[PDB]
Amino acid sequence: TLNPKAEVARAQAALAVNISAARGLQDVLRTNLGPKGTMKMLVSGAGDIKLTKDGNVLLHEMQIQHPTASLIAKVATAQDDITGDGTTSNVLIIGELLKQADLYISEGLHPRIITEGFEAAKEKALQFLEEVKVSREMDRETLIDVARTSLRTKVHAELADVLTEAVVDSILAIKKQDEPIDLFMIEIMEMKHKSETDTSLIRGLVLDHGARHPDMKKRVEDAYILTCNVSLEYEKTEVNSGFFYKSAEEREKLVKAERKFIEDRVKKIIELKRKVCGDSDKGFVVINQKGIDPFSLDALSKEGIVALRRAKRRNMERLTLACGGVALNSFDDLSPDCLGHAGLVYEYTLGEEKFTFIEKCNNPRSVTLLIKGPNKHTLTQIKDAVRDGLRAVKNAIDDGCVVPGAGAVEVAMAEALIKHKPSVKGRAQLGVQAFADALLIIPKVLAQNSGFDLQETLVKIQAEHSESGQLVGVDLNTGEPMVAAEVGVWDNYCVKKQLLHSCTVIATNILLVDEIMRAGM
Template identity: 85%
Template sequence: MAAVKTLNPKAEVARAQAALAVNISAARGLQDVLRTNLGPKGTMKMLVSGAGDIKLTKDGNVLLHEMQIQHPTASLIAKVATAQDDITGDGTTSNVLIIGELLKQADLYISEGLHPRIITEGFEAAKEKALQFLEQVKVSKEMDRETLIDVARTSLRTKVHAELADVLTEAVVDSILAIKKQDEPIDLFMVEIMEMKHKSETDTSLIRGLVLDHGARHPDMKKRVEDAYILTCNVSLEYEKTEVNSGFFYKSAEEREKLVKAERKFIEDRVKKIIELKKKVCGDSDKGFVVINQKGEEKFTFIEKCNNPRSVTLLIKGPNKHTLTQIKDAIRDGLRAVKNAIDDGCVVPGAGAVEVAMAEALVKYKPSVKGRAQLGVQAFADALLIIPKVLAQNSGFDLQETLVKVQAEHSESGQLVGVDLNTGKEDAAV
């Protein structure tokens, strides 16, 4: 430590117990911020940037990205949650809550003199047992449309209000089913998310085709074409300026006219090539021919009623930017949830049912662990109960009373029992 002070006199050095206390405090602080977000009854957070920009969200991943976290331990936990979002697309808030609770439970034993190494041994043993338990309770099902709708609804209702979630659910599931190919991995990049500041959020819909954020390039172009040939191109039909600053100097008006003609010829040559391609591709049919250019503003072009569309568009509508951003974040999580369900071919019940059952299984497993590592297993089991506790608390019910009822019902029935967030009573999870 003296060497650190020699190299940097301003360095702050925290020794064993003090460093541990600071790290646990940071984790619990992050937990306190996010715990009110969990579940469909969770609350929104308003984030205000230094420039005054406002963002409303209850998505844990968005909050962790937008908050300016300076503490290294809290920053590390945020990165873990971000990795969780990258892999599964959801569960970031639950992740942070469980991490914070693991450290909180561990601190209770460490304060009594138990070495952290013993706690981690118990955590490792509990983790292996928990993974085995998950394999036992998972429900393998055929991922038909109804099952996927239940999965999507569960995810979306934790991000937006119930009425909007029900509207988005079918659109999300149908978009995945539209791009799904037999025996091929699902590519979510084939689902385009387009924003339109128009009408209300419940007008969000699935377009089985493409929606482009620009309209016609000329006022005389047709506003509607059916059974059309469509050319999509990534070249501009306007004269483009150079990427570096440059200028032209004319000696006479004739030279300027020559330059204008050269610019016009540059575009006309491209148009002629498109016309020649039309003759080759379209022949003498009566079908329309549409050129969709990549540039434009405000107006939208819809390409619908395609045969066997392999790319679809979720058209998000809303009265303001805040609503559009919130729906977009929710849809991304919903898409990932449905994709994961199809890839895994199985589901587990929600409402804290798995956590309650897993905690009981770990308590029964504890006597088989040798020595003081049993305390680490007990701490792991107690930490898992943070999920049903917070779900009940955010729904306005007494967390201890609710948890006791759920645990008692699970012990008596042997079934997976969760928290009914509408009544606060225990209910068999489906």
């Protein structure tokens, strides 16, 4: 029953093909869950090596051979765009949801009955999450526990204290008075010639191109920032003329007249420099994005100006909002109203290149986090951990509620679902039981990666019962139960919230797949 040059899987074996793919993708990513989990390598083929535990990178950048498994990879992309965390745990729950459903489907149960149980277990699990969440105030002591919990899953337990204080302070500098937050205010720079532990903050901003003249000032403790976008190099004739010459030297003599339009504008720069506090113990800085002539640079260098040229659009953008200097598109309208101001402005010399720093600003509404490492892939690994750490502190601050980690929420919700009689359909509880057992994969995998027994760990945390709020988790170093709220392990409310919404939708849709047809393949 099929046309030539095609194929069709009519019976229920098409569903088993999708269950087998999710089971395989589960066993791949389960080894990189948590801090004690292993790392995966990404060989680009060209010769670039890359190590990372971020499940979004192991699904987005890693191409997957199986067709069905590539769908779940696209969801991990969508999961990372909303919360930025939980992509690995999303796949493990999907793999176990479809695993538990196959046990009942083999007994003659329809998939649509199981999916209706997931929708019921989701609402019960979603309501229980509202009770477990802690709506305490976010303080530096709390965000450190969030940043440590997020950063230890991406580093070697050595850059924890290094990147923790930087990731937390970077967020506190860009929020006050309940203002909306934006991570684009933080710039992420990378530099070589230093060990991995040399990461630190930069209150100001880093610029690529530096000054080019021997008489430049290596540091300017105070200056007015002049934003510009005019090419101070040799330009064409600005008036309605041409090249009326008789030899090469006469052509060069007209270039001098063409430089009169630029050379005079250099004097306008020197004029406002001498006017706006050109006295002793003062300075002046120009951040003109376009080029500057070598001879014109000699004029500004002798006046004590630290000039810059050939900047990027991103540098001029942050330089404006940070320093306040308005971009002057023509020196005819030069005026002191367009001038900014800043504190220390210096160029730190590295072994190979140099970069300009504009630190000691009042409230630039923009900062920079300077990462340092010996290798290329190590810098990319730390860049991903910082972005995952910042987004984790962002969610805890925006969504003021946090939830315990170490599988304490999954263990508590699973006990709640089992203590929940049917309310939508009698047979729907089989899916609720499958949803309950699916949530327990998170503490199970944490016991495996830590090297402890999968069954002993889960049974101990399940036996913890009392006449009071009690949420225990997996101790990766001990294996015994552990109150995640006491030791300082906290997850976000949106991460666990989006897991139940993402796991149920995909595990549902994959179960509703009845046939796999080739669309001209």
